[PDB]
C-alpha cells in the first residue's frame, strides 16, 4: 500500500527498495518567439532512483535528443522513466533487484506497472510523503553531470557520501531530506550555509562537504531555521 509517516521505518529494513523520482526527467525553458508566441526548449534531465538504505543513487541522464520529433512530451516522460527503471532492474543481478519500487508521484504507477509486467513479484507503491527529491538538481555535482552530458548516460553516486561509516540509514535519510527540503525552499540561503566556511571542502568523490559530527549539528540546525523562516514568510504566520 501507500508509504506514509506510519510505515516510515520500513525504508531502512533489509528488503531492497528504490525510490523513483521523475520530476527532473522532462525539463524546459519557456521563451518568446520572433512572432511573439511562446515556445519551449528542452534541457537535459535525469531520473533520480535511490536506495534509501544504502545511499546508492542511479542517476540516469535524459538527453534532449530523446524528445526529438515526439508529441505530448510530459506524458512521454513518464513512460521513458518507467522504461529506464525497468531496464535498470533487468541489468541488476537477481539478488540486487528490488522487492519494492516507491514512486514519488502517483502518475508513475501505471507506466511503471506496465513496464514491470515481467517482474510480478516487484511491488510498485505510491507514497503520501512529500519528498524533496526535485531539489536533486540543486546539488552542484549532479546538476553538472546532467548538463554536460552529450548522450544518454547512467552515472552512479552514493548520495550519503561516507555518512554511513558513522550514522544509521534512518539518520542519513533524515539528513538528506532535510538538506534537500532546504535547498528546495530557498536554494541561495541553503547553499550559503553549506559553503560559508572555505576550510570545509568537498572530497572529489563526494557530493557534500566533509563536516565533522559537531559541524553537522550546526549545519542541520541552520537548515531547520531556514525552513521554518520561509514558512512564516509563505503564509504570514
Amino acid at each position: 500500500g501507500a508509504m506514509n509517516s506510519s510505515n516510515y521505518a520500513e525504508l531502512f529494513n533489509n528488503d531492497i527498495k528504490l525510490f523513483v523520482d521523475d520530476t527532473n526527467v522532462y525539463r524546459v525553458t519557456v521563451h518568446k518567439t520572433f512572432e511573439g508566441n511562446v515556445a519551449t526548449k528542452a534541457i537535459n534531465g535525469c531520473i533520480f532512483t535511490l536506495n534509501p538504505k544504502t545511499g546508492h543513487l542511479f542517476l540516469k541522464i535524459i538527453h534532449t535528443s530523446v524528445w526529438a520529433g515526439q508529441k505530448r512530451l510530459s506524458q512521454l516522460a513518464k513512460w521513458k522513466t518507467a522504461e529506464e527503471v525497468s531496464a535498470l532492474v533487468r541489468s541488476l543481478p537477481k539478488e540486487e533487484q528490488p522487492k519494492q519500487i516507491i514512486v514519488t508521484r502517483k502518475a508513475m504507477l501505471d507506466p511503471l506497472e506496465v513496464h514491470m509486467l515481467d517482474f510480478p513479484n516487484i511491488a510498485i507503491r505510491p507514497t503520501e510523503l512529500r519528498l524533496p527529491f526535485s531539489a536533486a538538481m540543486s546539488i552542484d555535482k549532479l546538476s553538472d553531470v546532467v548538463m554536460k552530458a552529450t548522450e544518454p548516460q547512467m552515472v552512479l553516486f552514493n548520495i550519503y557520501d561516507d555518512w554511513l561509516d558513522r550514522i544509521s540509514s534512518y539518520t542519513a535519510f533524515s539528513r538528506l531530506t532535510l538538506l534537500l527540503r532546504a535547498l528546495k525552499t530557498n536554494e541561495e540561503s541553503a547553499k550559503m550555509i553549506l559553503l560559508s566556511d572555505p576550510t570545509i571542502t568537498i572530497k572529489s568523490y563526494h557530493l557534500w562537504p566533509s563536516f565533522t559530527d559537531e559541524q553537522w549539528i550546526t549545519i542541520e540546525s541552520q537548515m531547520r531555521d531556514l525552513i521554518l523562516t520561509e514558512y512564516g514568510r509563505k503564509y504570514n504566520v
Binding site: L76, W79, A82, E83, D110, P111, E113, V114, H115, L117, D118
Partner: protein
C-alpha cells in the same frame, strides 16, 4: 410459439420471463408461460417473497427441447428440467392451456426490445460460460462469481467470461508498452477479436449476456465484465465502423431498459465518463450519449 409449463407454485415468488414479471401467491394455481417467441434465447427468473436476496433463473432456447419448472422443497427453489417424452409434454401443455392456467408472454408487436437486447446471444456460447453440460439450459444467480474474480473458489459454479485485464502481458506487447496501454487496438482486434472470440458477433453476445445477468440477477462480476468489454472498444483507436455503429445500438437498448432506480450500482461512473467523453470513440456513440445525458445526467 412455445410453452414452459410449471408443475405447481408452492411458495410466493416473483417470476420473470425476459423483461416481464408477475407476482404469484403461495399455492396459487399457476402452471406456466405460453406464447414464448421462438428464435431468441430467453430467461426465466425468480425472487422469493421471503428472501429478497438471491435472484436466480435459467437461460434457455425452446428449439433445444421441452423445458418445465418444478419447485423442489428439499433445495428450496424452482428448478428447470427437460422432459424427454414429447407426447407426455404436449399433453401437459394442452391440458394446462385448456384450463387456462398459463400467462401469455406479453409481447407488444411494435416492440423489438428483447431482440435488441439479445441480438448476438447464442445458447451455445452461454453454455460455455455457464458450464453444466448435462442440461440444455443454464442456471445463473446473484452470488455466482466470475473466473477473474476467483483469481484475486468453487469452479463448478463459476461464470467463465473471457478474462480482460488492461495491465497484463496479454494486453501489452513487449516494446509497445506505452502504445498498447494508451491504444488498446491490438488487444481488441488481434488478441480478442481475431484470437479468442473469432468475430465481433461472439464478442457482442458475451457483452450482452453479461449485461443481462447484471440487470436480472444483480450479478456484480457480470457488471464488471460488461464494463470491461465496453471499455476495451472505446479505448481502441482503430475499430471497424460496423462495430461502432452496432455498439451504439446495443448500449442504447441496454441503458433504455435498465431500471431507473439501479443506475447507482449498475453504471460505473469512470468507464461511462471516459467512454462518452474522453475516449477515442467519444464521438461514435451518439444515441447512447443522448440517452445517458437525458436519463442519468447525475452520473455524468
Amino acid at each position: 410459439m412455445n410453452t414452459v409449463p410449471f408443475t405447481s407454485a408452492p411458495i410466493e415468488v416473483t417470476i420473470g420471463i425476459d423483461q416481464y414479471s408477475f407476482n404469484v401467491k403461495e399455492n396459487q394455481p399457476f402452471h406456466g408461460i405460453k406464447d414464448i417467441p421462438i428464435g431468441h434465447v430467453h430467461v426465466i427468473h425468480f425472487q422469493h417473497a421471503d428472501n429478497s436476496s438471491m435472484r436466480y433463473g435459467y437461460w434457455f432456447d425452446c428449439r433445444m427441447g421441452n423445458f418445465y419448472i418444478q419447485y423442489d422443497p428439499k433445495d428450496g427453489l424452482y428448478k428447470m428440467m427437460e422432459e424427454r417424452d414429447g407426447a407426455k409434454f404436449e399433453n401437459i401443455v394442452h391440458n394446462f392451456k385448456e384450463r387456462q392456467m398459463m400467462v401469455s408472454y406479453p409481447k407488444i408487436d411494435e416492440d423489438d426490445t428483447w431482440y435488441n437486447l439479445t441480438e448476438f446471444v447464442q445458447m451455445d456460447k452461454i453454455r460455455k460460460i455457464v458450464r453444466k453440460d448435462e442440461n440444455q439450459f443454464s442456471y445463473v444467480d446473484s452470488s455466482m462469481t466470475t473466473v477473474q474474480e476467483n483469481e484475486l473458489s468453487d469452479p463448478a459454479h463459476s461464470l467463465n467470461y473471457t478474462v480482460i485485464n488492461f495491465k497484463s502481458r496479454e494486453a501489452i506487447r513487449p516494446g509497445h508498452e506505452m502504445e498498447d496501454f494508451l491504444d488498446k487496438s491490438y488487444y481488441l482486434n488481434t488478441v480478442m477479436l481475431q484470437g479468442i472470440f473469432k468475430n465481433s458477433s461472439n464478442y457482442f453476445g458475451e457483452l450482452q449476456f453479461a449485461f443481462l445477468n447484471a440487470m436480472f440477477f444483480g450479478n456484480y462480476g457480470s457488471s464488471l465484465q460488461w464494463h470491461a468489454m465496453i471499455e476495451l472498444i472505446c479505448s481502441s483507436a482503430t475499430v471497424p465502423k460496423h462495430m461502432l455503429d452496432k455498439l451504439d445500438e446495443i448500449l442504447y437498448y441496454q441503458i433504455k431498459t435498465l431500471p431507473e432506480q439501479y443506475s447507482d450500482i449498475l453504471l460505473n461512473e469512470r468507464v461511462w465518463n471516459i467512454c462518452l467523453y474522453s475516449s477515442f470513440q467519444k464521438n461514435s456513440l451518439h444515441n447512447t450519449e443522448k440517452i445517458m445525458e437525458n436519463k442519468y445526467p447525475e452520473l455524468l
